[PDB]
Design a protein around this ligand. Sequence first.
Ligand SMILES: Cc1cnc(Nc2ccc(C(=O)NC3CCNCC3)c(F)c2)nc1Nc1cc(NS(=O)(=O)C(C)(C)C)cc(C(=O)N[C@@H](CCC(=O)O)C(=O)O)c1
Length: 126
Amino acid sequence: SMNPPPPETSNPNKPKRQTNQLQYLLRVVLKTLWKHQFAWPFQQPVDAVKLNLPDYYKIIKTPMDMGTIKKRLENNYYWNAQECIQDFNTMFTNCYIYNKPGDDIVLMAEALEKLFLQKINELPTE
Ligand SMILES: Cc1cnc(Nc2ccc(C(=O)NC3CCNCC3)c(F)c2)nc1Nc1cc(NS(=O)(=O)C(C)(C)C)cc(C(=O)N[C@@H](CCC(=O)O)C(=O)O)c1
């Protein structure tokens, strides 16, 4: 089947606030993962058509990627920091659902998740 449209990243009707937690999520957490050797397979939605991935968007009905997260942070899409943390965790979980344990993409996701947890350990208080 065709790829779905990407997740929404901006909504002018959503209320906007800046918090220490959201700032840290963009400037520390996202930034660190984005520059990692293994960021690139996660920097945009999975193009399952081009990659010929069987049934990808039947298996993965809550897709998420770091390009979407980055835009959401930049557009003040998130009100609560937990919304952003949940999006990262959805991305990791989705990788572990679709792909065999120990395969290359899974090892890349695990390396990014380890870094994510290191940085989240120092998230500012609410
Ligand atoms: C986030 C994510 C999750 N799950 C997957 N599952 C995949 C993906 C690919 C394959 C694959 O190619 N299997 C071969 C053919 C069938 N038999 C076995 C060998 C696979 F089996 C599973 N992939 C995700 N992300 C992702 C992965 C990859 N490649 S990869 O092999 O996993 C690796 C080199 C190890 C990272 C590429 C991109 C990507 O975005 N590439 C281009 C645009 C697309 C294009 O040009 O075709 C870009 O960078 O823009 C993204």
